[PDB]
Design a protein around this ligand. Sequence first.
Ligand SMILES: NC(=O)c1ccc[n+]([C@@H]2O[C@H](COP(=O)([O-])OP(=O)(O)OC[C@H]3O[C@@H](n4cnc5c(N)ncnc54)[C@H](O)[C@@H]3O)[C@@H](O)[C@H]2O)c1
Length: 315
Amino acid sequence: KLERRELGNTGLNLSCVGFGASPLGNVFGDVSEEQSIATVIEAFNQGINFFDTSPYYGATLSEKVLGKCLKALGASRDEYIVATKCGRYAEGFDFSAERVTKSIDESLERLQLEYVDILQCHDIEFGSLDQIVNETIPALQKIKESGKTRFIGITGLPLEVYTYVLDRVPPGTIDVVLSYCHYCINDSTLEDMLPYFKSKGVGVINASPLSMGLHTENGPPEWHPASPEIKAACKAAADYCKKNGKNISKLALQYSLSNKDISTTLVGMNSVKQVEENVGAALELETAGKDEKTFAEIENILKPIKNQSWPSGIQ
Ligand SMILES: NC(=O)c1ccc[n+]([C@@H]2O[C@H](COP(=O)([O-])OP(=O)(O)OC[C@H]3O[C@@H](n4cnc5c(N)ncnc54)[C@H](O)[C@@H]3O)[C@@H](O)[C@H]2O)c1
């Protein structure tokens, strides 16, 4: 069975591999609704029980499609865990209490759910962090008390933005944090913040273990924000694996899964083959361990750009 890990103090047990549903909004090329449904059904059948989306992905399309996918499961509601977000929309950012209070109703309508398990502020580095602390999080606390979400959180790229918020709200205010692109073969800096997150009692969700396509055979999309030198070294690592009969995406995901202090790693998936590969990579990690010789050679290739990121937001 696919390993499950406790998520902070929420009592939720998430599969160590999570379903990133942003491709269901066509972020990484177009995908049919029938394929999306089959992909989620296969993910659930393989033991994945955690699904993450946002009103932003595909201008609310990802949520609509995921809502159809989850209905097609025909499963008990407590057998899967749904996370979505608020504050970032196709028409821009709005972290006001009025916006996010409307947003949860809009998301529940699209998702065809009475409640989500997790609701998080999306990309807070683009907002006023003082508004997040003093207006947005209180509004989310009222949404939680209404029952429309069970737990609340915050997401963003820069690791520093979390400390600003978590230092200023009372203990136990935030249930979960989602960080992305910082626990993968080229960037492990999320491990630097895990001691702080443990100190605040927050469950940690990692996302983008392929760093949004850097750790794939096809390579990153044209819009990927990483510098050319990050892209060149990631391509060299993928070419090394291809030359030696190795799967760069399998190894990248196995790297991200190896830290047990992270409850789940969301990986964007848009096909049943990707689900079969990614669950298989997780299962094989438990029974065969890691290919240490290839990881060491991958590390040597990525070393010059290790832990380099890119600017995001307005802080
Ligand atoms: N600020 C935030 O809150 C934030 C930011 C980014 C992502 N996320 C969440 O995290 C999810 C995952 O991140 P992501 O999708 O942007 O990047 P990712 O690292 O998960 O990679 C996704 C891309 O890799 C491809 N892929 C997946 N498995 C593969 C395989 N076995 N072989 C080859 N290719 C494979 C996917 O099709 C997609 O093109 C997202 O869907 C979303 O849910 C949140």
